[PDB]
Symmetry: C3
Subunit: 141 residues, 3 copies
């Protein structure tokens, strides 16, 4: 696909839970990682989402938070993907951070320049990408 | 309204589906286009949303993806608005892209500078704005 | 926590409404302000959210809209926090705006540079931060 989102992950539906107006879709990524997404029930049905369906998960860079220390907090954001900072491209007030994940999957996040300083992000650094389930778009081939 | 969101569209509710905690609102835009939004049920009731109600849909620029080629994928994002690139304002790491839609409605998206290069966006270029239903705020006059 | 989100608010759950796949959580902030969040029901249960639980609400800067005049519109976005512009850091195409709220809580928003001009934001200026309920992550200690 030619889409602006910097994150386009391939995977397979491992389970679906249909709600009233939304549906929760659990996805197993190409390399061990798991994601959850909430999409409208009309999309889950239109896309024919079911266990075993191959899909792509699409996440824009400004929808990914970065965390270097949870400090014992447990978050509601269902998607926590841990890796190492690969590249940092700094702009004026924002910076594009790409992390390398387990298996070689990369994830890019757009965060303020002040976050980069405060978390100590630099190539090599451990960090986790955090993505709320409602910020994941799914796609079917 | 004096609000930072760059996209404020006028329209009318064409249908409402009330869920348990959320509600799906389908909107017909001023010129042919359609949108779907998911808002809390408490807001749908507080705003008195019903078929025929005039409303505004509010979308911040960083919530709009741009796509130039779906490559046969079908996305869950309910809102796909196709047009032509009007203006590009490039910053350091991000760029503000405005598209002109059918009827003359404009939509602005904030994407990384690398997306602009990779999709070949430039004034005149065909592209679609993609917005997940959960990233639309609605307003009533 | 060491997390990129610029907004991390402490508060207590004042009520919870469980849906089919999502749950709505109403939170009373440390100083008078209130927030609503929509998270998956699986998270609400995993985090053991109930009335009186102390939590943190996490919101990234690009998820906060700024409004200086509603012009009589009522929005669906459940979280409207009013204060005064404290600092503005301008980048190339975006600018980071921090507002000081009632009690001394600060909230930072990332908006286009054109929004800053158009709303007349500058230190001292009245403005409200607007955050859709689905853009709030919750955390438990
Ligand atoms: O659509 Mo982007 O380039 O991930 O902000
Ligand atoms: O279906 Mo519920 O959000
Ligand atoms: O349960 Mo979440 O905070 O919507 O990923
Ligand atoms: O509130 Mo904005 O200027 O669409 O990012
Ligand atoms: O059905 Mo969606 O929530 O527009 O991806
Ligand atoms: O993760 Mo942010 O974009 O620095 O609030
Ligand atoms: O009811 Mo909302 O989801 O804060 O627009
Ligand atoms: O200006 Mo940069 O994001």
């Amino acid at each position: 696909m030619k889409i602006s989102a910097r994150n386009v992950f391939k995977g397979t539906v491992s389970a679906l839970k249909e709600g009233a107006v939304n549906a929760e879709v659990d996805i197993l990524l190409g390399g061990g990682d798991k994601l959850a997404a909430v999409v409208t029930l009309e999309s889950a049905r239109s896309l024919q989402l079911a266990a075993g369906k191959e899909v792509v998960a699409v996440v824009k860079a400004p929808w990914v938070l970065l965390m270097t220390d949870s400090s014992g907090y447990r978050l509601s954001a269902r998607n926590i993907l841990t890796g190492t900072v690969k590249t940092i491209e700094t702009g004026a007030v924002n910076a594009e951070v790409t992390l390398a994940l387990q298996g070689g999957t990369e994830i890019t996040s757009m965060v303020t320049k002040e976050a980069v300083a405060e978390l100590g992000l630099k190539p090599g650094a451990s960090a986790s990408a955090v993505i709320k389930a409602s910020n994941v778009i799914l796609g079917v081939p």
